[PDB]
Amino acid sequence: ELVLERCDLELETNGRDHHTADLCREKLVVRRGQPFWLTLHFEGRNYEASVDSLTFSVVTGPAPSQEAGTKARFPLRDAVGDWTATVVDQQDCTLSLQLTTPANAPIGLYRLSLEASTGYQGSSFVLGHFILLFNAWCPADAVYLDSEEERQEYVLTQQGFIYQGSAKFIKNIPWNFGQFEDGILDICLILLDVNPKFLKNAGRDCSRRSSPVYVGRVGSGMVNCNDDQGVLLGRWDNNYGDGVSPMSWIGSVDILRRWKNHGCQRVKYGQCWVFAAVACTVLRCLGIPTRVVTNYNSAHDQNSNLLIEYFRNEFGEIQGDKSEMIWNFHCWVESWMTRPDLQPGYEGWQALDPTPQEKSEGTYCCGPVPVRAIKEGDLSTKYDAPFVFAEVNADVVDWIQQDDGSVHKSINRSLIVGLKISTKSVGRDEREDITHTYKYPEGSSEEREAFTRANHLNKLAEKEETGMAMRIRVGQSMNMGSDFDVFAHITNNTAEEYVCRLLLCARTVSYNGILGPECGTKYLLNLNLEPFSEKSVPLCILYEKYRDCLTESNLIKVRALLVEPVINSYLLAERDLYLENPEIKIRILGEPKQKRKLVAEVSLQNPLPVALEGCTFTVEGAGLTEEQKTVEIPDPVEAGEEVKVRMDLLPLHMGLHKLVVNFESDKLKAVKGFRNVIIGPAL
Ligand SMILES: Nc1ncnc2c1ncn2[C@@H]1O[C@H](COP(=O)(O)OP(=O)(O)OP(=O)(O)O)[C@@H](O)[C@H]1O
C-alpha cells in the first residue's frame, strides 16, 4: 500500500502554549525545550504502525548538519536524545503527534520534513516551517526565569519606559518595543542572517544560535557597532533635518521596518537609548529576557580609565578639550541568561551595550558581562567587564588652572558617577532603582574588597575641606518655555567671615555632555560669607537666552565656582537641569472593545511665549494599531492656545496596551505622552 496524507494542521493552541500567540500568524512559532501539537490528516487510510514506518527530520541553517546541531531526523514512536516525536492519539484518518525540541536547540527557521516508508517505497516530503525561539518558561533553557511576572515583563511586555531627564529629576519616556508586531520577527532573523559571523561562515553562526550569550552579542552589535551593515546610524551634533531626531522615535517597530524596507540601510539617526531600545526589541522577540537600563552621570566613552582629570580656567570652565565629558545619562540593556562559559555563579543579568565607544584598541561595543561581576570588581570576567565598571565607578578630579603656573585641585562634592541606575518595574509603571545591583554601598567592606579586585582603591575623601560647601538649588520645577531661577547655595560653617569670588555659568547641554553656548552668567568678585551662615545667589535663566541651542532633551547645565583667595581654595558645583515639557492630555472615547473602533483625543497646551507651527501628533502602540498614526495641525497654535485632535484606532488584541504618542512642532519638538488602555472582549 501507500500512505496518503491530505493535510497537516499546526494549530494555534501551540501559540497559547508557547506564549507566542501574537507571533503566530501564517507560520508556526514555538519555544525550544517544549512540545507542540501536530495533527496529520490522511485520506481513506489512517496510519498503520504495522507496515507504515515514518521518520521525521528538520534542518535550519542554510547549511544544515547533524553534528552542528542545525539538522536532525528522528523516529516516530509513542515512547519518548532530545529531538523526539511521538503519537499522542489517532482516529478516523487523523494522527496527532507531539514533537519536542532540545532546550539548547539553535533558534531560527526550521524545515519540517516527513519520511514515509509504507513498506519500501513510500513518499518523503516537507510538512511546513516553524520558528524556534528561546524559552524562558523552560527550566532546561539557558534563559529560564522562575518568576512568572518577570517572564511577562521581560519577554512578553511590548510597551515600556526608558529613563531620561536628570538624576535630580528623572523622566520616564514611553516606548513601543512592539516585538510581536507583524513582520518584526522576520526582520529579526534577517538581522541575524546578515551579520559578519554569518557571512563569514553560515554554518558556524547558524549553529551557535543556540546560545543566548552568542545571539545577544550578535543582536547588540547589529544595532550600531560597525554600521558596515547596522540598523541605526548615530548622530550627536544636533542637526537631524535629513532624518528623524533620535528623541522623536517612540518605538523600535518603525525603525526596524524603515531598515528592511530600505534594503537594510542604516536608519536615519539614533542614540544610545535608541540603540538599547531596538536591541531590547530584538532580544525580547527572540525570547531572551531583556530590559533597557539607564545610568546617570555615566563615565562613558572614557577609554575605561577609572580616573578622569579635567582642567578648568579660573571659571570652572573645562578648559580641557579632546577630553570626554561625563554623560548626563547613558543607556544599555541587560539580558537574563546562564553563563556556561564562566566560573559558575555568574548566571543572571548580563549587561549588553549596543553603543560603540572608543576602546583600548578601536571602536566597537561591549557585553555581555555578568552584572554580579561588575559589582564584585571581577574585571577579568569575559566581555568588556572593565568598561562597564568605569561606566559606573569612574573617579573624577577637577583641576583649576592657576593664572600663574600649575593647576590647583578643587573640591567638587556635587558629582557622582553611577547614579539612580534605573529601569521599569516588573508588572508596574513605577521606576525600579537597580543601582544596588552594580555597586556595594559606599563605605562598606564589600565595596573595599570590590575596588580591590579592580585596583580602584582610589577613594580617601577629603573629609577636612575648608569649612565650606556649595550646591545648586532649583527652588521648584521649571518648564520648557519660561524663565526661572537657579541658586548657588553657599554654606559657611566657620568662625571666619570669608570674602570670595563666585563664578556662575549656565549652558545648554546635550544628553551626553556636549556643552553649548552660555544661557546665563553672574560673577560676584566680592561675595561676603558671614560666619556660620548660608548665602543664596540667584541666576536668571531666560527662555529668550537658551531657546536657540537647546536639545530635544531639554537639558541645561549650571556651574558654579567659589574661590577663596586667602587659603587659595576652589569649590566646584555643577548640576544638570531638565526643563519640563507640557503634558499631553489623553481621553479614550467610547468602549475599549476588541476588534472595534476606538478614538483617542490628545491635547497639548502651547507653553512657549511664541506661536507653534507645523504641529504634528504621532501615535503608535502594539495592540492598539497595526500602523503608526499621524495627524497634522494645519494652522499655528498661538502662545496661549491649546491643540487637540482625535485618532481612530482599531485595537486588535485584548489585554493591556500602552498607547505612546509624540508631539512635534517647529519650536517644540519631541514632547511625549502615553496612556494605559485595557481592551476587552467584543462579545
Ligand atoms: N531639573 C529639574 N527640573 C524640574 N524640576 C526639578 C528639577 N530639579 C528639581 N526639581 C524639582 O524641585 C523641587 C525640589 O527638588 P530638590 O529638592 O531636588 O531641589 P531643591 O529643593 O531646589 O534643592 P535642595 O533640595 O538641595 O535645597 C521638586 O519639585 C523637584 O522635582
CB of residue 578 inside a 6 A radius of ligand 1? yes
Tell me the C-alpha distance between 425 and 562, whole Å: 40
Within 579-670, strands assigned E span 585-589, 598-605, 615-620, 629-633, 642-649, 655-664
Q: What letter does residue 20 receive in the DSSP assignment?
A: -
Please state, in angstroms and rounded to a whole number, the distance separating the CA atoms of residues 112 and 54: 13
Q: Which three cell numbers stand for residue 221?
A: 552589535
> Technique behind this structure?
X-ray
Q: How far apart are CA 663 and CA 612, in angstroms?
A: 11
In the residue annotation, 330 being an active-site residue is answered as yes
Distance 475 CA to ligand 1 centre (A): 6
3-class DSSP state of 148: helix
- The CATH class that applies to domain 143-467 reads alpha beta
CA of 396 to the centre of ligand 1 (A): 24
Q: Which of 24, 188, 272, 331 is catalytic?
A: 272
Residue of 474, 535, 546 with the most ligand 1 atoms within 8 Å of its CB, for mutation: 474
Q: After which residues is the chain broken (C to N over 2.5 A)?
A: 80
Spacing of C-alpha 195 from chain mean position: 21
439 residue type, one letter: K
Q: What distances in angstroms separate CA 671 from CA 480, 580, 665, one per listed residue?
A: 10, 10, 9
Peptide bond into 517 cis (omega under 30): no
495-508 b/e (C-beta count within 10 Å ≥ 16 → b)? ebebebbbbbbbbb
Contact 174, 674 (CB under 8 A): yes
Q: Is 580 in the pocket of ligand 1 (CB under 6 A)?
A: yes
- 8 A C-beta contact, residue 206 and residue 63: yes
- 607-635 b/e (C-beta count within 10 Å ≥ 16 → b): bbeebbeebbbbbbbbbbbeebbeeebee
Nearest to 357 by CA among 406, 302, 308: 302
The identity of residue 122, as a single letter, is: G
DSSP sequence for 472-515: EE--S--BTTS-EEEEEEEEE-SSS-EEEEEEEEEEEE-TT--E
Calpha distance 187→282 (Å, rounded) = 9
Provide the residue type at 491 as one letter: T
Q: Which atom of ligand 1 is nearest to the CA of 576?
A: 1
C-alpha angle 622-624-626 in degrees, rounded to nearest 5? 65
Task: Please check whether residue 481 is in contact with residue 607, taking contact to mean a CB–CB distance below 8 angstroms.
Answer: yes
Alpha-carbon distance of 627 to 181, in angstroms, equals 10
- Strand 407-409: give its sheet, edge to edge: 307-312, 395-401, 407-409
- Going from the C-alpha of 167 to that of each of 164, 330, 422, 557, the distances in angstroms are 8, 12, 10, 12
Contact (Cβ atoms closer than 8 angstroms) between residue 545 and residue 473: no
Q: Name 175's bridge partners.
A: 160
Tell me, what amino acid is at 248?
S
Is 41 assigned a catalytic role?
A: no
On the CB side of 519, CA atoms within 13 Å amount to 25
- Residue pair 255/249 in contact (Cβ under 8 Å)? The answer is yes
Q: Is the CB of 538 inside a 6 Å radius of any atom of ligand 1?
A: no
Amino acid at 606: N
The bridge status of strand 395-401 relative to strand 307-312 is parallel
Supply the DSSP string of 380-430, one letter for each residue. Answer: TSTTTHHHHHHHHH-EEEEEEE-TTSSEEE-B-TT--SSEEEEEE-TTSSS
Contacts of 627 (CB under 8 A, 6+ apart): none
476 ligand 1 Cβ < 6 A:
yes
How far is it, in rounded angstroms, from Cα 262 to Cα 216? 24
Would the CB of 477 count as within 6 Å of ligand 1? yes
Q: What is d(CA 315, CA 38) in angstroms, rounded to the nearest whole number?
A: 74
Which listed CATH number (2.40.37.10, 1.10.3720.10, 2.60.40.10, 3.50.50.60) goes with 583-680? 2.60.40.10
C-alpha cell at 595: 476588534
Single-letter amino acid, residue 140: A
Half-sphere exposure at residue 154, Cβ-oriented, CA atoms within 13 angstroms: 29
Q: Is 414 in the pocket of ligand 1 (CB under 6 A)?
A: no
Q: Ligand 1 in contact with 536 (CB < 6 A)?
A: no
Ligand 1 contact, 25 CB (< 6 A): no
By DSSP bridging, strand 419-424 and strand 555-564 are: unpaired
Q: Alpha-carbon Rg of the chain, whole angstroms?
A: 29
Give the atom of ligand 1 at the shortest distance from the alpha carbon of 475: 22
Q: How many Å apart are CA 158 and CA 147, to the nearest integer? A: 18
Angle subtended by helix axes 272-286 and 184-192, to nearest 10: 100
Regarding the domain with residue range 468-582, which homologous superfamily does it belong to in the CATH classification? Immunoglobulins (2.60.40.10)
Catalytic status, residue 300: no
Closest atom of ligand 1 relative to the 477 alpha carbon: 5
The closest alpha carbon to 355, from 435, 293, 433, 425, belongs to 293
Residue type, 254: D
Contact 169 CB / ligand 1 (< 6 Å): yes
Per DSSP, what are the bridge partners of residue 73?
57
Å from CA of 661 to ligand 1 middle = 27
163 beta partners: 172
Ligand 1 atom showing the smallest separation from residue 577 Cα: 1
Contact 108, 132 (CB under 8 A): yes
| CATH domain 1-142 topology | Immunoglobulin-like (2.60.40)
309, 314, 319, 320 alpha-carbon torsion, rounded to 10° = -10
What are the φ/ψ torsions at residue 360 (nearest 5 degrees)? -65, 20
Q: How far, CA to CA in Å, does 50 sit from each of 30, 46, 122, 616, 659?
A: 32, 12, 14, 70, 58
* Element counts in the chain: helices (H) and strands (E): 11, 35
For strand 53-59 and strand 348-358, is the pairing parallel, antiparallel, or unpaired? unpaired
Going from the Cα of 556 to the center of ligand 1, the distance in angstroms, rounded, reads 14
For residue 177 the three cell numbers come to 518595543
Cα dihedral angle (652, 657, 658, 664), rounded to 10 degrees? 0
C-alpha span between 453 and 380 (Å, rounded): 9
CA distance 102 to 71: 12
Catalytic residue among 330, 365, 398, 505: 330
How many Å apart are CA 121 and CA 134, to the nearest integer?
38
Strands 28-31 and 124-133: parallel
Specify binding-site residues for Ca(2+). Answer: 393, 395, 432, 442, 447, 534
**Minimal CA–CA distance to 340: which of 303, 392, 382?**
382
> Is 478 close to ligand 1, i.e. is its CB under 6 Å away?
yes
Domain ranges of the chain: 1-142, 143-467, 468-582, 583-680
Same fold, 468-582 and 583-680: yes
How many CB atoms lie under 10 A from the CB of residue 678?
11
Nearest CA owner, ligand 1 atom 15: 476
Q: Whose CA is closest to 36, among 55, 15, 21?
A: 15
Q: Is 5 left (phi over 0), alpha (psi -120 to 50) or beta?
A: left
Task: Calculate how far, in angstroms, residue 557's C-alpha sits from the geometric centre of ligand 1.
Answer: 14
CA distances from 233 to 50, 70, 240, 324, 526 (A): 62, 33, 11, 21, 50
For residues 312 and 398, the answer to whether their CB atoms sit within 8 Å is: yes
The cell numbers describing 466, all together, are 575648608
Length of the chain in terms of residues written: 683
Looking at residue 436, the DSSP 8-state letter turns out to be: G
- 371 within 8 A of 349, measured Cβ to Cβ: yes
Q: Catalytic one among 353, 378, 384, 398? A: 353
Q: Using the mean position of ligand 1's atoms as its centre, give its distance from the Cα of residue 489 in Å.
A: 13
Distance CA 103, CA 338 (A): 13
Cell numbers 578648568 correspond to 312
Give dist(CA 637, CA 644) in Å, integer: 10
Atom of ligand 1 nearest to the CA of 166: 1
Distances (CA, A) of 434 to 291, 303, 418, 420, 424: 12, 25, 11, 8, 10
Q: Can you give the resolution of this entry in Å?
A: 3.1
Packing angle between helix 272-286 and helix 212-221, nearest 10 degrees?
140
Cα of 400 vs centre of ligand 1, distance in Å, is 28
CB atoms within 10 A of CB 20: 23
The C-alpha cell of 143 is what? 534563559
Nearest CA-CA partner of 291 in 333, 250, 257, 326: 333
- Distance from C-alpha of 521 to C-alpha of 296, rounded to nearest angstrom: 26
Distance 477 CA to ligand 1 centre (A): 6
Closest CA to 431 of 105, 172, 679, 56: 172
Q: Does residue 168 have its Cβ closer than 6 Å to ligand 1?
A: yes
Q: How far is CA 53 from the centre of its chain?
A: 50
Specify the long-range contacts of residues 445-454, CB closer than 8 Å, at least 24 apart. 449/377, 450/375, 450/376, 450/377, 451/377, 451/393, 452/377, 453/376, 453/377, 453/378, 453/379, 454/306, 454/377, 454/379, 454/389, 454/393
What residues have CB less than 8 Å from 70, skipping those under 6 apart?
Answer: 59, 60, 61, 63, 64, 106, 203, 206, 207
